[PDB]
Amino acid sequence: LHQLLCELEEFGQAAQRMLNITPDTGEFLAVLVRAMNARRVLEIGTSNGYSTLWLADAVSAIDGSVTTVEYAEQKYRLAQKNFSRTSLAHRIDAILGDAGTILGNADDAVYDLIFLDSERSQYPGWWPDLKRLLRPGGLLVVDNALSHGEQMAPFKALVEADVEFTTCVVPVGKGEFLATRSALEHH
Amino acid sequence: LHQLLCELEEFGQAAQRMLNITPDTGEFLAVLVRAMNARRVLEIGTSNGYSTLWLADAVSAIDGSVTTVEYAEQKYRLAQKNFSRTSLAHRIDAILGDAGTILGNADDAVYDLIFLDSERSQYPGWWPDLKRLLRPGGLLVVDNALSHGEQMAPFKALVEADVEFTTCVVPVGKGEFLATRSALEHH
Ligand SMILES: [Mg+2]
Ligand SMILES: [Mg+2]
Numbered sequence A, B: 001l002h003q004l005l006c007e008l009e010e011f012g013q014a015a016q017r018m019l020n021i022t023p024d025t026g027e028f029l030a031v032l033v034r035a036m037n038a039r040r041v042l043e044i045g046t047s048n049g050y051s052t053l054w055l056a057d058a059v060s061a062i063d064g065s066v067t068t069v070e071y072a073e074q075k076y077r078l079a080q081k082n083f084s085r086t087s088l089a090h091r092i093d094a095i096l097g098d099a100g101t102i103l104g105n106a107d108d109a110v111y112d113l114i115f116l117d118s119e120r121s122q123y124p125g126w127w128p129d130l131k132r133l134l135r136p137g138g139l140l141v142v143d144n145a146l147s148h149g150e151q152m153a154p155f156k157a158l159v160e161a162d163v164e165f166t167t168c169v170v171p172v173g174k175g176e177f178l179a180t181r182s183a184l185e186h187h
Helices: A002-009 A023-035 A050-060 A073-084 A087-091 A099-105 A120-133 A149-161 B002-009 B023-035 B050-060 B073-084 B087-091 B099-105 B120-133 B149-161
Strands: A040-044 A065-070 A092-096 A111-116 A134-142 A165-170 A176-181 B040-044 B065-070 B092-096 B111-116 B134-142 B165-170 B176-181
Touching (some): A023 A050, A023 A111, A023 A134, A040 A050, A050 A065, A050 A092, A065 A073, A073 A092, A087 A092, A120 A149, A149 A165, A149 A176, A176 B023, B002 B023, B023 B111, B023 B134, B050 B065, B050 B073, B050 B087, B050 B092, B087 B092, B099 B120, B111 B120, B120 B134, B120 B149, B134 B149, B149 B176
Parallel strands (some): A065 A092, A111 A134, B065 B092, B111 B134
Antiparallel strands (some): A165 A176, B134 B176
16 A cells, blocks of 8 residues: 555646645545544545545545545546555445436435545535535545635535534645534434 | 634734634634544643633533643633633633643543643653553644644654554644544454
């Protein structure tokens, strides 16, 4: 895994082999998945699977799984090759398809952590599905929050207006927008 | 709480009323405590209680508690006044004393999250106690990791050498060093 990550890092930041996240964003996800015991992870935006490998290693440490979604066949096949080079492929459900469809069909409260690194213009439309898929207590992590503040702004505003979420921005890599869903009232 | 935090923020960054963390560090702690369901928090370095209030609000949302430690009576009494101005004082065990003593005496695996913002030269000496107090799966968050990299370096090296920890650095505020303790082998 260490060797494979180092080889993938030789291509630098985003042609299909260029990385969708910084290495220190991957390190951040590694800590978050372990620290919140996030056994059920969803990723929207596999790219070549670099981010997925950090998530998959993390869920392997807590006997969990990653479901990832990628629009582009070219990136998906690179991702399949990368996963085939590790013992972690069995922990990854890699879907080649349309995230709006995949999100529309998933079940309620099924994910502990969702990592979003896809088409930012789509996020406001996906928000009802992202909110219902995230368990109460779960965490949403969104990449490119500072590199692409203007594109992210409508989505960040929707999430910040939702009293059921606590949010922040972490300037790791291209910026992470974090949002955690409150527990509901219980007896 | 919002009103009290805004008033405390009028004093800016570190004389006893000047803040020990940035507001966006407080927002980060708010998300972390909720997202990891960290009902048992330990803080080393209360200062005037600004950081403590973010932690206390967070644990209030998950019916938890914060134990905080401050060396300086002047800062401790400011912290008591600030806590007395909220419904959250009942969630805070504020100890005026020596962190090396308090840590030496606490029980094993009693804390979900530990926030360190104290005398950085001391951290390597405290490390055996910090490791044993943090539950497996728990998170250590250390402030001033980038503002004071040289002072932090021996401690960061000890923690990075420990195969039971997964680590990263988040450039929020003066820099957060995060370290999460692995689960042990289970049946
Ligand atoms: Mg990205
Ligand atoms: Mg500080």
